[PDB]
């Protein structure tokens with residue numbers, strides 16, 4: 539799996555919504571609960587073209603100190619998945635929360651594409 543492909547699997551769910559069951563099902567189907575319960579994960583509902591375009595938008599500092607992060611000029615429809623208190627592997631359990639926020643992604647490679655989801659603001 540390429541880094542670009544991993545980003546698409548972990549963070550992209552293009553749709554033009556999310557039920558209380560959404561994260562429980564999506565974290566499983568996208569193979570994010572295979573080894574452990576991933577505590578926090580965000581899905582983005584805008585088009586792949588729109589998210590890829592963020593790599594040419596506002597340059598901002600990455601949480602890790604690198605300079606290859608970019609913030610979206612427009613807000614984007616997203617869903618945050620957060621592990622519940624009662625959640626126990628292999629039965630990982632999640633709270634589903636919809637939001638409309640600017641996203642921050644890290645980009646790499648040629649083509650220069652998103653490889654990491656840094657934050658929403």
Ligand SMILES: Nc1ncnc2c1ncn2[C@@H]1O[C@H](C(=O)NS(=O)(=O)C[C@H]2[C@@H](O)[C@H](n3ccc(=O)[nH]c3=O)O[C@@H]2CO)[C@@H](O)[C@H]1O
Pocket residue numbers: 578579580600602604605606607644645646653654655656657658
């Ligand atoms: N500039 C870079 N350029 C290139 N690569 C970079 C760069 N920076 C990191 N990586 C890489 O990413 C890898 C990854 O393991 N780091 S991770 O912070 O823990 C991933 C998290 C984050 O996606 C997720 N989260 C978080 C908030 C939110 O709203 N939504 C949401 O989904 O939760 C995860 C845990 O935080 C690491 O191996 C490192 O090499």
